[PDB]
Symmetry: C3
């Protein structure tokens, strides 16, 4: 009896003609995409120039100090100090300071609608040469005359001081550059590019024309060294109510640029995909997307440095590598990418492939740029990855498809041998199978309880000596009480009624046979025992393939410096001060009490 | 003799019963995961409102200027100018400026604990109408009375000036909004929401109640246009020691919000995975993670705009697309993600699938947000990729497993034909193989030196004319001097002793046979020569599969603007100034010398 | 006739000896890389300390106020208020304020080169105790004496006020820490670490030595609480022209550090690849690249906290997990990664694997750090992904290669059965194939028009009763008028001339046969009809594999806060103010008009 019973039994007769089936034809294997045409080239990326136009100048003024003093016995107290900074008149700058490096001990200027005049020491005007300032770590240059305050003499009236001061400083002007400031925190409400030449008079000024002046062929005389006329300039000279500042007038457009060069890309591969271009600098790990057309520097505001810098850089680069390997291809091309980034691009071709497409590339505004260039480095990554995995996986499907094609060539010859099995496998269920011409006549098989099956001890034929069986005989019943059938066993638990599986008696006749969960054994055509597959050392026909799915992962908010670490980086907080300062009175004083008597 | 000897030889007899082996059964192929259920919906993302509460007001004050002058022959010098900014009294604002647009030529205010009174021109009080300020590019509005300083008349006392000034400015208050400032850099130590209505008196104030006032049904009269009563307001009026500022009192909570709307997401797919939710806006390329529960706006501080804005936006969006395709699903849902981001989410369902889960979603504090939203766009990416590669690779393993299943169906029939080979392959080593029942009796093969093997010139049988051999005869010896065996050759360098491979003599009898590194040839059962595989044009049975592993790549530190490019973007550096300014004295003066006589 | 004609026909004779071919040998399957050796360890990452050295001090000064008043009938006006802040002399700080908490009602100090003396109320010196300031929300502590300004008495001279003020404030010094400032916005041009001990005199000072002092064993007496001598200190005392500030002198190097601890990494796997190291904190999702050598803290400037903090942190961590599982491995190791990031790393080994490599790890400068740590989190990601996909795909190629190896074992036995087909498949074109020894004699097949082919109704043999054909007879012609050949049909549209495919007549003889686009049917060896494959329910032999390529995706510029949202976050804009302020005069005054008479 079927000891090992963790299986099902089947009985498969010759499958009646109907039904008949056919194998699926070879499938059309997919094709590798032609790929993606990339254009090798050099690129330069500009950015919204948030940097203020920087230049240098010179301040000329005098620190006037009028002091009143009250004299008492064995003591003295300041009664009211009046400090002011007054301009050094135009002529006093040209004829006095520049030429000789001197300055009047007197100050004459308009203040509060009147011609006030101050005399140092309250003594007749004496011209006094200038001397370098004192200890000044990390400070631009500066000179002056007076070094001591003047106070009234002993008694029981007033004293005026006049220190002609001149300082070299750093000036900072920002778009639209209609005005600028200094390192002293002093505003100057005139465009640094104001003047007369170049129609500079068009530029902005808040002052009367008589205040401003513009000296031509001006030879500055560097004090201290006393050196002079190193270079002639068109010295602009404005006279503020509090001082007189001057600087070398320079052209606007050439000196400024609303954009700043950010990156020099040696190889910026350019490709089209979806009505846009693709610039991927693998060197920097970045990818930009731009419309198909270019961008005229004409619509740009004061972006003169742009074209200038682009050319210089590119030509510079083309001379390091490409000058031998490749060759230029048309005039510079400019495209604008998302995030407000301007891309200067010059295509390249190696002699190996020795254009018209490059042609036909063609108020005022200004460009804004995103402080974050991550969306691009992201795109870059994704694409380079996606593109890869796709281009790769595709190759698989093809080979696979092709494999299944060749495999069929095998299934064809195979079905000839064991249709009953081959077909059963191709139908995913035990079925009777036989070849009816080129197609296959088939009819399902029938399940049989293993508990109802038992084998005969004899593989021999009492009625036919000399000859024996090739397969031991068996008996079974579908139902729990069903009739008993004299059918012989076939491969893989099939119950072949027709007992025509025979073979002449053989010497040294060992043989194992599939029998339920395990096998059955027979020595010399005589039964032996049943066993489990475990006993028989199993060998595999499969090519192993160990795979592991990519695990998850958490990306936590991570920052190098929180904005608060920045609001603190500022050594001085203008808000902290003014708050505490304008709160000073409230803390240490009462502003509501009135007194009288 | 075996000329081509870059190979090994084997002799395979009928493998003795022991040992016997079995093929590995079909393996259980993995199953596709049910997938990931995504919930379609609309979302809105708020952020820590770092923006200061912005509002407008009006300043009212007078620029008082007392000047002392010393008169000399042919000259005159200011002896001490005293400038001050004094408030314009309450009544003077309501009865004078508002109604008629005028202002007194006199200033009466408390300063340093006393009732000082200033008269413009030192002349009896005259009411003077106000006039718009002068040229003012990029400046809010402003008016005034006086336009010239008043100085003492010729001699050899003092002159007071009074310019009633009023300016429209921009006020800025920040959390907790207990106070605010102006564009003039003037602090006002009172909560902008202070007053009486709405229990505003609860709000913060550093001033006595008599200073502050709150006019009801106030009809402002726009100067210049002289238009008036366009709209009535509850004008708040505070009087600082230096001026009198006023503004329309407004409610707090409605006007402010500690959070600001950042992004309107049309489709924010929501899914659960690992006790958290998944909101992936594929449009923006971002993914947020939130706890399973919601977040009550109750724990929020003054976050009233939140719910308001969320509703407006969502309903707005639902009317563009979803209003036809989908339908709302319950009240708005709010979840908090990592990085301090608040997510407003409203689920959606198309009629095709026409909830309780949405239910059961349920001092004071404030939310902080990370300035970097990259950890999210990272997560988003990773997942969308990982999830893909996994979902894909899985499909492979399955198909593969299935392939190996079907493949077995072939290996079964195949072993019947060339067990000696099929098995040798399944054992990874040359072995003798024969079918013992359903299993396979096997016994390893034996290596034989090729240098010891030589073939016989004759494939014919001198003793048996008419008939010949199907395989030429050979001889060999295992050892270097071992006995010589009369065995015939079998397929693939097997040495079948039993010389029973025969065939009747055939006409036009060409035949090639595997012979060491190459082959051996025989014409008409008579030897010819040996050759190498090279000669025979080889054909492949393999389906090619060209693969390439993803190359490495370097991600270099890349920034659009270094923090230093920012510390410079600021036109004015409060630190640069105050340093140079407070260093001014050290550079151009001595503070250690004392004088007397 | 061939009704279904969407196919081609072929005639295949026994392929003449030439030409002959051979199958491709098994290919050498690739090997799994040994992998990547990772070193488990703990790490700590420092960063460019952009934070200013923070410490506390105390200001001591007096608010002197000299006021002149003009008296008139029924009125009075300030004629000129002179406000000044003067220092509280050294002795007055030690003997008066510290001990008793009092201060002189008089101020004696040098101003404008003279010994001015101020008396509160202009009355003989009286010592006045100090009292806490008034209402002060979010302000450090502060005390004072006077609380009211002093003004001249009724008439028709001057009044001086003296408010001894002392404030606790927050001091801020930045590299090189040669000077510092206060919360009052007051600069102090002396290195906070100046003094005498520790050779502090080396530090920077802009003042004469007599101004600065350094009290030893100083016991501060906390006012209000009047508590004293809680702790003795080396009180530094500098006396600026405007005040006298003091603070506890402390060592420099220990108190400061040009680097700040950023992240404590529990597990920072370290590995080598391409002459550099690999530190991947999977916890944070980050990867750093450093040279093979270390970095001496010797080249570091004032980076003392570094080693200190590194040790504390690490040892701390090693006591939470590793103390039991792993064991320390040598002294701390420091490497510098790109982006200016310093990595403190301590390797680890579990007892399971229980070093020399760790050894041999070995003016002044300072480190700069990138504000963006994304290039790293990028690298991290890419690698972890790339490495995965590679390590995975590889496994495929191998298994695949191996599969094709085993597959051959099948192709060998298969070709024996249907060479004509097997070979045709291996040649990618219909060819005649037969086994010539071990190789295969082959010769291409010939295409034949289907329109020229017709089958015979009889599968029977009139001349040979009892026996019949196994394959119906056919006729055809290559050319459009070519000769008619008596060849029988073979499998797959082959035209086997030799009509030797026979079989005895059979009962119930159904049979289908491939016939052009469809099939042909015969009942009892008598023709029936033709049909299309559609009729016959097709069954597949292929293992399906549904794949999908990863779709594209757009990464749009996305920012949490634009830099402009930051330029606004600042409650006060020093530029806005000074612009409007220094523009005040232009708006409400004329600076070009002169008057006289
Ligand atoms: C780059 O890819 C394009 C896109 O396919 C290729 O253009 C194809 O070229 C082949 C012939 O070489 C043909 O299919 C057509 O001429 C093109 N088809 C398409 C779809 O465009 C191109 O050949 C590739 N490489 C280069 C250098 O041109
Ligand atoms: C979404 O995925 C879940 C997770 O499997 C699915 O829920 C399963 O549904 C199937 C029957 O359709 C069964 O396995 C169980 O009902 C669920 N199993 C698990 C593991 O949850 C769900 O069907 C999927 N789709 C939808 C729209 O529900
Ligand atoms: C980590 O990977 C390296 C690199 O291969 C391994 O070193 C190899 O070890 C095997 C023997 O185990 C041999 O190929 C050589 O000794 C090494 N080859 C190379 C290329 O280096 C190492 O074994 C791996 N793991 C450990 C823990 O050592
Ligand atoms: C590019 O052109 C398209 C129209 O083709 C326009 O919609 C889009 O705004 C342009 N992009 C930029 C960056 O200006
Ligand atoms: C082209 O390349 C070479 C590389 O050595 C470079 O030195 C040179 O400047 C370039 N061309 C010439 C001849 O200048
Ligand atoms: C979410 O809830 C968990 C507990 O379930 C808590 O540990 C965690 O802090 C919460 N996250 C946020 C963002 O508050
Ligand atoms: C629904 O969608 C349509 C789209 O045309 C939109 O115009 C409409 O406002 C929505 N519903 C209605 C009827 O308002
Ligand atoms: C690391 O060392 C290499 C030379 O081996 C040098 O070129 C490079 O500048 C160094 N990197 C850093 C971060 O200093
Ligand atoms: C080692 O690990 C344990 C974990 O419980 C920790 O508590 C302990 O501090 C460590 N070692 C010891 C004994 O302190």
């Amino acid at each position: 009896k079927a000891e090992n019973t963790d299986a099902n039994f089947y009985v498969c007769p010759p499958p009646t003609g109907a039904t008949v089936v056919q194998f699926e034809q070879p499938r059309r294997c997919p094709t590798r995409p032609e790929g993606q045409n990339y254009t090798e080239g050099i690129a330069v990326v500009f950015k919204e120039n948030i940097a203020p136009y920087k230049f240098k100048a010179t301040m000329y003024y005098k620190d006037v100090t009028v002091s009143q003093v009250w004299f008492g016995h064995r003591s003295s107290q300041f009664m009211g100090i009046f400090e002011d900074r007054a301009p050094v008149p135009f002529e006093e700058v040209i004829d006095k300071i520049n030429a000789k490096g001197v300055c009047r001990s007197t100050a004459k200027y308009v203040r509060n609608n009147l011609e006030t005049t101050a005399f140092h020491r309250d003594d007749h005007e004496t011209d006094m040469e200038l001397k370098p300032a004192n200890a000044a770590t990390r400070t631009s240059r500066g000179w002056h005359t007076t070094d001591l305050k003047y106070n009234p003499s002993r008694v029981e009236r007033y004293g005026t001081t006049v220190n002609c001061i001149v300082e070299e400083v750093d000036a900072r002007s920002v778009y639209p550059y209609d005005e600028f400031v200094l390192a002293t925190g002093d505003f100057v409400y005139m465009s640094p590019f104001y003047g007369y030449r170049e129609g500079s008079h068009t530029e902005h000024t808040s002052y009367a024309a008589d205040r401003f002046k513009q000296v031509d062929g001006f030879y500055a005389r560097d004090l201290t060294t006393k050196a002079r006329a190193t270079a002639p300039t068109t010295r602009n000279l404005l006279t503020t109510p509090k001082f007189t500042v001057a600087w070398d007038w320079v052209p606007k457009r050439p000196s400024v640029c609303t954009m700043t060069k950010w990156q020099e890309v040696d190889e910026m591969l350019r490709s089209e995909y979806g009505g846009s271009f693709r610039f991927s600098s693998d060197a920097i790990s970045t990818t930009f997307t731009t419309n198909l057309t270019e961008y005229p520097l004409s619509r740009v505001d004061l972006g003169d440095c742009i074209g200038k810098d682009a050319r210089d850089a590119m030509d510079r680069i083309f001379a390091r590598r490409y000058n031998a390997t490749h060759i230029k291809v048309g005039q510079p091309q400019y495209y604008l990418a998302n995030g407000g980034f301007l891309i200067a691009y010059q295509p390249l071709l190696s002699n190996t492939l020795a254009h018209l497409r490059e042609q036909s590339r063609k108020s005022v505004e200004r460009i804004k740029t995103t402080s974050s260039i991550e969306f691009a480095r992201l795109q870059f990554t994704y694409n380079h990855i996606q593109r890869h995995v796709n281009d790769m996986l595709g190759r698989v499907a093809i080979a696979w498809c092709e494999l299944q094609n060749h495999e069929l060539t095998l299934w064809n010859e195979a079905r000839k041998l064991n249709p009953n099995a081959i077909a059963s496998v191709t139908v995913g269920r035990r079925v009777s199978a036989r070849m009816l011409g080129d197609v296959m006549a088939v009819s399902t098989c029938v399940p049989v309880a293993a508990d109802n099956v038992i084998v005969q001890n004899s593989m021999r034929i009492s009625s036919r000596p000399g000859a024996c069986y090739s397969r031991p005989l068996v008996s079974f019943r579908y139902e729990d009480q069903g009739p008993l059938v004299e059918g012989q066993l076939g491969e893989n638990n099939e119950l072949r009624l027709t007992r025509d599986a025979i073979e002449p008696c053989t010497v040294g006749h060992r043989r194992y046979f599939t029998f339920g969960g395990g096998y059955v054994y027979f020595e010399e055509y005589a039964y032996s025992h049943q066993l489990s597959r475990a006993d028989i050392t199993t060998v595999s026909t499969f090519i192993d393939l160990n795979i592991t799915m990519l695990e998850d992962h958490e990306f936590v908010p991570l920052e190098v410096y929180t904005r608060h670490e920045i609001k603190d980086s500022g050594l001085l907080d203008y808000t902290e001060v003014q708050r505490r300062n304008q709160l000073h009175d409230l803390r240490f004083a009462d502003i509501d009490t009135v007194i009288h008597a």
